[PDB]
């Protein structure tokens, strides 16, 4: 009942499909999420991975995929919604 976007930059080495759609597998109770991971080289965006992610309170009830981490090496977000990893943005924690 939950579907995400798939991406693997190491598509050739791992002999996996580069990009596409992924049907998730969870449980009757288990909430499912979509993850997205990328790089930011002072503006330029380099993709890393995208796909299914398991029940995590860090992703609970978050409609949008937003990286809350400030100035990290590998930017990451997760969200709870069908294809919500379609796009991502960065916005640090207010604090």
């Amino acid at each position, epitope marked *: 009942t939950r579907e995400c976007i798939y991406y693997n930059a190491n598509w050739e080495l791992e002999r996996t499909n580069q*990009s596409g759609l992924e049907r998730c597998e969870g449980e009757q109770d288990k909430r499912l999420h979509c993850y997205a991971s990328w790089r930011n080289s002072s503006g330029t965006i380099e993709l890393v991975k995208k796909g299914c992610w398991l029940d995590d309170f860090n992703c609970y009830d978050r409609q949008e995929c937003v990286a809350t981490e400030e100035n990290p090496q590998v930017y990451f977000c997760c969200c709870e919604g*069908n294809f919500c990893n379609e*796009r991502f943005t960065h916005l640090p924690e207010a604090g």
Partner: antibody, heavy 119, light 115 residues
Framework: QLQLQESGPGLVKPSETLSLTCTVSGGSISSSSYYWGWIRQPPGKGLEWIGS???????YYNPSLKSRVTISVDTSKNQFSLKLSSVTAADTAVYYCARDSLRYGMDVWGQGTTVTVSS | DIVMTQSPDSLAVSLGERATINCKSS????????????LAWYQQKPGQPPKLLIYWASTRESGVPDRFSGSGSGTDFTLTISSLQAEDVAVYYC??????????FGGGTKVEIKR
């Protein structure tokens, strides 16, 4: 704030080929979306989906125009182009580029370019 | 190729009164996601591109007033303007963003004011 801008000739000779390009500000083509599409609207007529593409180059076209339509993707300059061969007077229309999203619809649109096919 | 059909072609309604436009699809656009109703409604004024009004056939996009309400399910849907206002004079379209992709648009319904 996502902004889309089309670029290309407003005039095209008949039987030739039409080329337009959508440039993206606010976000990249890899982030900010998956599919990016092209739409066209003839004068005083309804909207017609041309095609759409992804940041990998996964191309999907309208059945009526699969013959001549060609979408490109340039991850470097935040662009995606449209090329339509063997133009006719029926291809005189306003062309728009839009963010084709799975959830939601056509989120953001460009202001469109009026392309006239004439000698 | 999920064919879309809109009705009527034009509307003339006095300001304050309600407006109603219908959109019928040649295949039910529901999906096992339960979000179902993969339909969108857009408002286009003369010089401008279409402005997204409603997605999921029910939910609104930010900034769109309460006077606009989407409805329906399966194959039949409706867009309803509870109280037509002067700034609402436009041509409204419906579109299916169903996964299987002949991405089809409706005909368009021009709303007008009786003044």
């Amino acid at each position: 704030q996502l902004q889309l801008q089309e670029s290309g000739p407003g005039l095209v000779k008949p039987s030739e080929t039409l080329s337009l390009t959508c440039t993206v500000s606010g976000g990249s083509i890899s982030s900010s979306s998956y599919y990016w599409g092209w739409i066209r609207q003839p004068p005083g007529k309804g909207l017609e989906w041309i095609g759409s593409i992804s940041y990998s180059g996964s191309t999907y076209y309208n059945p009526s125009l699969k013959s001549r339509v060609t979408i490109s993707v340039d991850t470097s300059k935040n662009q995606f182009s449209l090329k339509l061969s063997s133009v006719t007077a029926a291809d005189t229309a306003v062309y728009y580029c839009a963010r084709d999203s799975l959830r939601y619809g056509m989120d953001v649109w460009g202001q469109g370019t009026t392309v006239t096919v004439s000698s | 190729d999920i064919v879309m059909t809109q009705s009527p072609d034009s509307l003339a309604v006095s300001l304050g009164e309600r407006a109603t436009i219908n959109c019928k699809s040649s295949q039910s656009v529901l999906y096992s996601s339960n979000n179902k109703n993969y339909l969108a409604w857009y408002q286009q004024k003369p010089g401008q591109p279409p402005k997204l009004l409603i997605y999921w056939a029910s939910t609104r996009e930010s900034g769109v007033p309460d006077r606009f309400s989407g409805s329906g399910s399966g194959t039949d849907f409706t867009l309803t303007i509870s109280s037509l206002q002067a700034e609402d004079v436009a041509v409204y379209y419906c579109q299916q963003y169903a996964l299987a992709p002949p991405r089809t648009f409706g005909g368009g319904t021009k709303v007008e004011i009786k003044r």
